[PDB]
Design a protein around this ligand. Structure first.
Ligand SMILES: *P(=O)(O)OC[C@H]1O[C@@H](n2cnc3c(=O)[nH]c(N)nc32)[C@H](O)[C@@H]1O
Ligand SMILES: [Zn+2]
Ligand SMILES: [Zn+2]
Ligand SMILES: [Zn+2]
Lengths: 286, 278, 771, 150, 285
RNA sequence: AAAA
RNA sequence: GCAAACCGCCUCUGCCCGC
RNA sequence: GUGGAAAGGCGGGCAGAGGCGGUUUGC
């Protein structure tokens, strides 16, 4: 279909590539800052019905990357039948280890076509060492810290589907607030800051019964093919319990997911984003 | 609560050559961009140097600031390194690992501190978050083009160590950024309380003015600092800006002003329109 | 009982093959195995050896003619004394006969065993001892009768002092039949032990399947699905053993690798006992991945569906989605074991099961039913070591520093890590017993120490095939492990800080992770289960047994001169974390981790026939680098050596241009030629440089600074005369004469200049001097 | 032999260090190359290995005899020159106007190569076409130390 | 324990190279003056580092304190832990001799603790290091570039350096061994910057007078160079002492006390009447 | 993860 | 009538201690 | 309603020690 693509042009290093539950927690903190409490409860109701955002994925110079579906690994002997067998084995190995695909090869992997992987990743994970210095004696205490450093024209983006007045009233004012404050990590070191641009993405998807998730899922029923993701964040100092999400690219069938409210002992209820972002996929016989 | 984000832009001039090490072909390397190989000033190295200069500033004026800043009456000048007990009566109360740093342990205490209100506090159960963002300072576009045109952006300076009796020489090498370089800094203050933001902007500019006579990173005592702030503009970015995006925010123009002139003169004069919309 | 009689009939059916290659009696080895077992029933043996001579005289379909001489010969013996039914004994003979054809599908010479890696090369006969001898295939296809005669005498001595059970016989047979060829033919690459072992496996799976003697006489067990190939794999090992912080010592890691293997043995030994199988039904068990041949009965499919259900639910309670065991099974037939016509049916049924493992791994914890269900539990925390989430209060203080509250499964592995130098093995007993440190999904394991008595029905004894101090009612299960460690002044395992102190020149900790390349293609060329067994034991025995004797300083006439910084010590400061299957993870001093990577590869090159290669990633680290950091760099370096090309080593971190035409890792013969030319003209040995280069690090480091101008612009030619000026001013114009001019042949081949590949030789020499 | 070792692009810098470190064999192929350097009056026409090709064959000729640079170094610092290239041609004329004795021939061959490239530098821009000359002039001195001269 | 702040005494002026000055250096270089002088990579002109000036002032001051370990000990405690000499003939780090750290192979007096370096006249002014404590310095000496009239003589075409050829003559055969030394020309003039950080109002007289003692020793000794061959001859030309109190940074106004000694000598400030120049500093403490 |  | 021979660097040091 | 909040890679360290632009004889 047709989606609004929210590009995030970085102004430094990120802490991690953002997911949809820490994007919804960042947006719900942004809406509470510039509107108030009763607009976050109007935000959650907009997401529960209709429109839902996806996870954040890298881009590198007008090539928008998307996660590889998990539908290809049972098929991946049948995808590569037209190859010489001694180079069919190392083409298969790197086609299974690959995490992202181009916007051109994502649309082919949804239809079980022969496809190719990107060679170069738009970011790197470095370990930059910081230090703690005593204020009288200058006694150093090294600790280590990891970041996401992007290239010259690279960055990250997520997708939005839904009505326009929810985007132009909540999501578009939030990402202008969230550009000057951070998305995750030590934003007081200037980490999660960016400039925001809004664009348009069109994705060819076959009409089918199965669908891949482009966000974390929190499924209501057991999915078809999946990959377990085990994270639990932090909310106003309170540790969240770890939850079993489903990584991006896993296959569900008529499964909407669902946001789960937590208690955590605050003045308000904390919602963890668990909605699906379905794009139609084609499966083999299992 | 949230009211706006005072945005400070300008340039960092390295008047004498700058060193911020990585400890990873020069023997001690300054830290560099992983992709393009250009050096930069970290946001943590600039923030922690502004805090360290200001924690020593507040340690000298604990008695004189008991009334403008409460919960400076909970501290006595000194460090907690002699008696190995955290959050005691001394000012440098928290031992992160091997170093002692003033961090107030509570939200209601750090809200009245001058340091931890501006720079943030950890605490147990409490977690006061900071109000400023210090971005990474990368090279200006004029100094990226000098790098494309074949000039050198870092040198290799050889120092030595000399015996006081026999005069044996013991040399080492230090990579440091070439003196004269221009970096592009960015500080974003988060206006949470409309009452005390004038003090927080002035306490921040005081640490900038202590930094121009002190050094940044480096060896510094052997002349590796000598940093200089060159301001460009002070934006206010109100709450009405983030709702609708119509670009009618307050811009204070200081194209050629020092940190002493900015804090010394101006502020009421420069920040007069900022104080109107609160 | 017919259960023990069918299994020990098929195991000993080929007995006397080694007495006919020796020649103690008259010809036709089926006659000699009847006489070798009749004489064995006389002295130092029971009377069941007399009835097991029926299995060695009525096979290959040469004397079992017309169903008349089998009845008279069995009638002469007393079945009732043994208690076996007269008809039931006859039923077993047909099953043994059928399982012999299903295991091989295959003379007159004393021709040796040929190597499964080179079928053109052959093994000389040795023992299976892993001590002072490396079995390296050679072109010597001749076996002396006296050598066979010596083997028969040792075999006769050990079969007389050995209890008549499948577990007892299997280590006796393995010791002397490992290097004996089964069928005498040119290029026979199947071990005689493997053929005998796979024959007791199939004959016992046929007996559990219920097929009788007339089912074999009519050929009904063949061309009907009566067998069932079990296969398991642990998934998430890297995130299970190496996801540990700076609070994990070397001992804690070395206990994590011993605890994953006890989880693996607890599942495999549960399948064999609960289905009636012996240990010969296990085809291989190597690297968290096993394969078992069983029977296809509805009682067994019901019974394997509980072993899978209980073990996955145990792993989910203990380790919250960090380690998963995918168990699948595929029904096969007798004709499916072999090559039928020209089509390989064993490699097709194996890959019909390998696709079922693939879809199971994508349904990662689907057999839980509360997997994606949320449940609110208050007051949860994390362990400082492995970082699992528990409800707090279940945390308990660690014995190192009682301020930190670790989880209880990490204190069982700190206390196990202190016993591993003292440990002779384990005993498999019930979940709630005294002495149990760690629990599996089905059992608990008591450590069997130096001076002690083992308790349990199954005793796992490490690094030997002799049951010395073991009770005669307990089951003997041997397992092998690469357990080399550098010992401290105490009798324990050295630390990361103690190994790095011993390193030559700069003090760094060397970490290597290497594995065999395209092994899974090599195992798909096997067309019979007795051939998959041989290719999997010999590949496992290199990393289990022979990689620890490479570290002992042996095999030097095979290894020769490798790139070394110092001469090889008598006790190398090397600690093996893991080595088994086709991979190894070894830490130590950085000088010997560097040398052993070329020393393991040179011996693996000759352990195989030159036909299989390695890729090794090397890393050199600070002592206070956390091991989740040290295992993620060297795994990234192993995958960079593998994706770029196979048979290349990642020597050290280097800077290379982004054109896609440079690569970071060295081919093994490439780097080992660069060390023959660049190193003896700059390096003298044991940390010092040569004459006229002492205190000239202003030459060598600046040569790496000229090399960094090549990295910025490879087409700029500035670096060429800056080398000749630098070499010329210092008077060392003859050192490195090919870095001064551009290689015109390298431009046409689009391969890098010789200044690009001098980095990984100089850097190592500059770290062997104190840096 | 001498033209087989000192070939077109880069054949043997290590092979030319055996003959030069013999007298008249290089004195013909490099004099043809000095005539080719005289045919390289256009300086900025060699973006290939030709600058490294010529400077080996220049320094293999000047090795047979004895054999401004800081003025070329200070005018290199001026980039970050028509008034000083007159002085640079003057100091190069001053040296050949001074060196009498056994070193006239090495200085006249050194006079033969640079002043054809110092005529184009008069009527040319200064950021380009001098960087390509100062890379050549460094490469002549660099190999001249390598062959055993000073 | 208790590092405070009161102000930053700033010492500005000029470094006069009365005699040729050579601070040496050592990479894409082919034909040049051998044994070169250090130069700014962006502007090309030579300079004096803060490392070569602070280390030369510390070295002349340690040797002065080593000469008198019985005449400074009554005013400075923890000098009773030191005997005059060096730790060279017995290779232990911290024994009773004065020069007590091994840098690589040489021996330099650097105090090993915070409480030891707080009462030492050398290490409370120049700083120390060690296993823990790490007493940090109170002066910062900055790199001294040319003055802005010698920036412009370079624009006018004058030489800022030169090349001096010296010859090591064999004493037997009178056989030569020439070499060239670049040296910044005599008369050249470098602009320096020395900031003393007032951390204790009790002893700031003692650190300024010890810093001016070290400067007075340097005007009799040499800077950089090979100075026993006449290559040093430095001279300090003071422009202004300034005080910069703690209230200067918060207010940003010119509340800094300006001592006027634009025409005075380094031995004239430390000369009788020093009390008269630094009298207004005591009015602000 | 080429069966860690 | 005025020069021409060689000598153009030599030899030591070149990352430490802490987290 | 953000795997979050807090945290300077730096304390100390002279590119220095010894050295007459000089000698011998002729073409
Ligand atoms: P210290 O008492 O070591 O506190 C432990 C703490 O510090 C880190 N640490 C200390 N020294 C080093 C070092 O040389 N290198 C590294 N990478 N880390 C160091 C420990 O890792 C631990 O976090
Ligand atoms: Zn505070
Ligand atoms: Zn744990
Ligand atoms: Zn001292």
């Amino acid at each position: 279909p047709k989606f609004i693509a929210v590009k995030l042009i970085p102004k430094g290093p990120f802490r991690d590539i953002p997911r949809a539950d820490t994007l919804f927690g960042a947006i719900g903190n942004a809406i509470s800052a510039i509107h108030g409490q009763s607009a976050v409860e109007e935000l959650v109701d907009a997401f529960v019905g209709g429109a839902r955002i996806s996870s954040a994925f890298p881009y590198s110079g007008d090539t928008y990357y998307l996660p590889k579906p998990l539908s290809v690994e049972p098929a991946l002997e049948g995808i590569l039948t037209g190859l010489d067998e001694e180079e069919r084995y190392t083409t298969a190995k790197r086609l299974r280890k690959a995490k992202y695909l181009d916007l051109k090869n994502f649309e082919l992997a949804l239809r079980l076509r022969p496809f190719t992987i990107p060679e170069e990743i738009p970011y790197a994970r470095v370990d930059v060492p910081r230090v703690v210095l005593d204020r009288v004696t200058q006694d150093s205490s090294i600790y280590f810290w990891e970041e996401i450093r992007f290239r010259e024209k690279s960055g990250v983006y997520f997708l939005y589907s839904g009505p326009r007045e929810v985007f132009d009233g909540y999501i578009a004012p939030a990402m202008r607030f969230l550009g000057d404050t951070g998305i995750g990590g030590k934003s007081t070191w200037g980490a999660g800051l960016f400039e925001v641009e809004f664009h348009e993405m069109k994705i060819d998807a076959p009409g089918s019964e199965y669908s891949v998730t482009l966000s974390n899922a929190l499924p209501t029923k057991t999915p078809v093919l999946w990959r377990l993701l085990r994270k639990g964040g932090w909310s106003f100092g309170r540790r969240k319990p770890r939850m079993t999400f489903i990584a991006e690219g896993s296959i569900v069938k008529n499964d909407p997911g669902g946001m789960e409210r937590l208690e955590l002992g605050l003045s308000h209820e904390v919602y963890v984003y668990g909605l699906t972002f379905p794009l139609g996929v084609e499966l083999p016989e299992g | 609560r949230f009211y706006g984000k005072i945005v400070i832009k300008g340039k960092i001039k390295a008047v004498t050559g700058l060193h911020i090490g990585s400890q990873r072909g020069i023997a001690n390397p300054v830290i560099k961009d992983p992709h393009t190989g250009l050096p930069y000033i970290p946001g943590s190295s600039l923030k922690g140097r502004l805090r360290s200069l200001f924690e020593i500033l507040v340690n000298s004026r604990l008695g004189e600031w008991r009334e403008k800043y409460p919960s400076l009456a909970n501290y006595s000048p000194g460090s907690c390194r002699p008696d190995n007990q955290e959050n005691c009566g001394k000012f440098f109360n928290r031992k992160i690992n091997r170093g002692w740093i003033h961090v107030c342990p509570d939200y209601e205490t750090a809200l009245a501190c001058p340091v931890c209100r501006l720079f943030g506090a950890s605490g147990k159960e409490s977690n006061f978050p900071s109000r400023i963002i210090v971005r990474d300072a990368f090279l200006t576009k004029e100094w990226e083009e000098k790098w494309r045109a074949g000039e050198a952006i870092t040198e290799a300076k050889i120092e030595v160590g000399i015996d006081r009796v026999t005069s044996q020489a013991n040399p080492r090498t230090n990579e440091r950024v070439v003196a004269g370089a221009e970096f592009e800094f960015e500080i974003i203050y988060n206006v949470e309380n409309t009452t005390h933001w004038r003090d927080d902007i002035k306490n921040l500019l005081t640490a900038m003015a202590l930094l121009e006579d002190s050094y940044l990173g480096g060896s510094g005592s052997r002349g590796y600092g000598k940093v200089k702030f060159i301001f460009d503009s002070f934006e206010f970015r109100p709450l009405d800006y983030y709702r609708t995006g119509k670009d009618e925010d307050i811009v204070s123009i200081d194209a050629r002003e020092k940190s002493v002139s900015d804090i010394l003169s101006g502020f009421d004069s420069l920040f007069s329109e900022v104080e109107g919309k609160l | 009982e017919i259960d023990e009689l069918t299994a020990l009939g098929g195991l000993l059916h080929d007995i006397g093959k080694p007495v006919q290659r020796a020649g103690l009696y008259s010809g036709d080895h089926s006659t000699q195995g009847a006489r070798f077992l009749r004489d064995l029933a006389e002295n130092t043996g029971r009377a069941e050896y007399e009835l097991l001579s029926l299995f060695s005289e009525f096979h290959h379909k040469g004397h079992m003619k017309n169903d008349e001489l089998m009845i008279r010969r069995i009638k002469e013996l007393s079945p009732e004394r043994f208690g076996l039914t007269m008809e039931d004994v006859l039923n077993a003979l047909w099953i043994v006969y059928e399982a012999d054809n299903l295991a091989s599908g295959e003379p007159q010479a004393s021709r040796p065993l040929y190597s499964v890696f080179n079928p053109g090369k052959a093994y000389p006969w040795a023992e299976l001892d892993f001590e002072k001898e490396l079995p390296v295939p050679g072109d010597v296809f001749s076996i002396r009768s006296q050598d066979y005669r010596e083997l028969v005498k040792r075999l006769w001595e050990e079969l007389s002092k050995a209890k008549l059970r499948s577990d007892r016989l299997l280590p006796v047979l393995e010791k002397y039949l490992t290097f004996v060829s089964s069928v005498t033919s040119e290029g026979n690459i199947i071990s005689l032990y493997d053929h005998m072992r796979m024959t007791s496996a199939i004959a016992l799976a046929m007996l559990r399947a219920g097929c009788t003697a007339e089912d074999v006489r009519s050929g009904r067990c063949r061309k009907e699905k009566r067998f069932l190939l079990i296969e398991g794999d642990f998934s998430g090992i890297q995130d299970f053993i190496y996801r540990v912080s700076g609070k994990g010592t070397l001992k804690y890691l070395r206990a994590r690798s011993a605890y994953l293997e006890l989880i693996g043995w607890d599942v495999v030994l549960e399948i064999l006992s609960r289905l009636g199988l012996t240990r010969a039904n296990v085809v291989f068990n190597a690297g968290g991945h096993f394969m078992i041949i069983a029977q296809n009965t509805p009682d067994a499919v019901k019974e394997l569906e509980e072993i899978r259900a209980k073990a996955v639910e145990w792993l989910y309670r203990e380790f919250e989605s960090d380690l998963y065991l995918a168990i699948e099974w595929e029904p096969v037939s007798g004709r499916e074991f072999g090559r039928e016509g020209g089509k390989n049916l064993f490699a097709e049924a194996r890959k019909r099961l390998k696709h079922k493992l693939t879809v199971r791994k994508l349904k990662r914890f689907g057999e839980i039913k509360g997997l994606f269900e949320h449940g609110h539990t208050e007051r949860l925390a994390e362990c400082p070591v492995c970082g699992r989430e528990l409800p707090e209060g279940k945390l308990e203080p660690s014995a190192s520093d009682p301020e930190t509250k670790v989880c209880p499964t990490c204190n069982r592995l700190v206390s196990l890590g202190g016993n591993l130098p003292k440990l002779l093995g384990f005993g498999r007993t019930a979940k709630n017993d005294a002495g149990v440190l760690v629990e599996g999904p089905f059992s608990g394991f008591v450590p069997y120490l130096q001076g002690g008595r083992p308790v349990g029905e199954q005793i796992l004894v490490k690094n030997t095939l002799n049951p010395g101090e073991i009770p005669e009612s307990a089951q003997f299960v041997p397992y092998f492990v690469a357990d080399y460690f550098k010992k401290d002044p105490k009798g324990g395992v050295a630390t990361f800080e103690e190994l790095s102190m011993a390193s030559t020149g700069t003090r760094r900790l060397g970490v290597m992770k290497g594995d065999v390349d395209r092994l899974g293609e090599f195992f798909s060329s096997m067309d019979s289960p007795s051939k998959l067994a041989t290719a999997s034991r010999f590949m496992d025995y290199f990393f289990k047994g022979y990689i620890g004797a490479i570290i002992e300083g042996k095999f030097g006439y095979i290894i020769g001169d490798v790139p070394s910084l110092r001469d090889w010590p008598e006790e190398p400061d090397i600690v093996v974390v893991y080595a088994g299957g086709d991979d190894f993870f070894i830490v130590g001093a950085w000088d010997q981790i560097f040398e052993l990577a070329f020393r393991v590869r040179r011996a693996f090159n000759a352990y195989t026939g030159g036909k299989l290669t390695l890729s090794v990633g090397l890393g050199y680290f600070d002592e206070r680098t956390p091991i989740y950091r040290m295992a993620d760099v060297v795994s990234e370096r192993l995958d960079t050596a593998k994706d770029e090309g196979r048979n290349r080593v990642f020597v050290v971190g280097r800077s290379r241009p982004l054109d896609g035409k440079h690569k970071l890792s060295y081919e093994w013969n490439h780097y080992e030629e660069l060390w023959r030319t660049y190193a003896p003209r700059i390096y003298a040995g044991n940390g010092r440089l040569k004459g006229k280069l002492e205190s000239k690090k202003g030459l060598l480091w600046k040569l790496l600074e000229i090399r960094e101008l090549y990295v910025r612009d490879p087409n700029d030619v500035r670096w060429a005369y800056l080398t000749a000026y630098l070499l010329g001013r210092h008077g060392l114009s003859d050192l490195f004469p090919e870095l001064v001019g551009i290689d015109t042949k390298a431009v046409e081949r689009k391969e890098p200049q010789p200044v690009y590949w001098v980095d990984g030789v100089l850097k190592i020499v500059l770290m062997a001097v104190r840096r | 032999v001498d033209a087989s070792r000192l070939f077109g692009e880069s054949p043997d810098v290590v092979g030319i260090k055996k003959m030069l470190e013999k007298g008249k064999q290089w004195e013909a192929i490099q004099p043809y190359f000095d005539n080719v350097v005289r045919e390289a009056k256009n300086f900025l026409e060699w973006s290939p290995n030709k600058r490294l090709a010529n400077a080996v064959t220049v320094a293999a000729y000047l090795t047979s005899q004895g054999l401004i640079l800081d003025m070329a170094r200070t005018t290199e610092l001026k980039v970050k020159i028509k008034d000083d290239l007159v002085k640079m041609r003057y100091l190069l004329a001053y040296t050949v106007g001074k060196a009498t004795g056994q070193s006239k021939y090495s200085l006249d061959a050194f006079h033969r190569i640079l002043d054809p490239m110092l005529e184009v530098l008069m009527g040319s821009p200064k950021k380009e076409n001098f960087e390509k000359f100062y890379d050549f002039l460094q490469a002549v001195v660099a190999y001249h130390k390598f062959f055993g001269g000073g």
